[model samples]
Target: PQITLWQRPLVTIKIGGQLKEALLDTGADDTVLEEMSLPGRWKPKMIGGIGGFIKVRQYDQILIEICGHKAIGTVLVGPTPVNIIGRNLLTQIGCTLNF
Candidate 1:
């Protein structure tokens, strides 16, 4: 069996701090918010999955928007050396990737 994909261009957004450029990749499973670029006033908590299993270390909220695509909700945040676009956010936006 084989498969194909119809991926859309990534979107970039600006935050309330010194975060110059941040790209949004659908290929990414988790939203990777630059920790260093974040403002000094943010309180995020640890994220866990089923059975309270810790999947990500720390998590924060940020604003995101794609040209025509409606930008909604605060994106997830993780530490450095780690960047992603988790399906979690996609679900919220009522989007699903057909595989």
Candidate 2:
């Protein structure tokens, strides 16, 4: 689906049978979600952005469905300001930016 930049490129996403909204951020290197309980084991990880770095739980091999597209990879569970679908998952969905 085509969307304009006037608003955030936010879209509906399904994770672990739960529905939520997230932004398709091209600048983010990895997908990060708000702090939540997820099944399985996770490791301590640190990820940084423009705001700096923060400790997060790194959950690997997790499945996330974004806008009807399926993607499975590492999803960082942390205190992110917002849920972000970064390049790691975006490439799997074949989502790209166009002028």
lDDT of each: 0.45, 0.91
Stretches off by above 4 angstroms in model 2 are: none
- Candidate 2: deviation at residue 28, Å? 0.6
**TM-score per candidate, in order?**
0.41, 0.95
**Model 2 TM-score on a 0 to 1 scale:** 0.95
lDDT of 2 at 70: 94
* C-alpha lDDT (0 to 100) for residue 37 of candidate 1: 47
TM-score of model number 1 = 0.41
Q: On a 0 to 100 scale, what is the lDDT of residue 66 in model 1?
A: 35
lDDT of 1 by residue, 14-98 (tens): 4443333443345555665545444334545555443452333333455444333343444555543434344546555555546
Off by over 4 Å in 1: 1-30, 36-41, 47-61
lDDT of 1 at 26: 52
The most accurate candidate by lDDT is: 2
Measure candidate 2: CA RMSD: 0.9
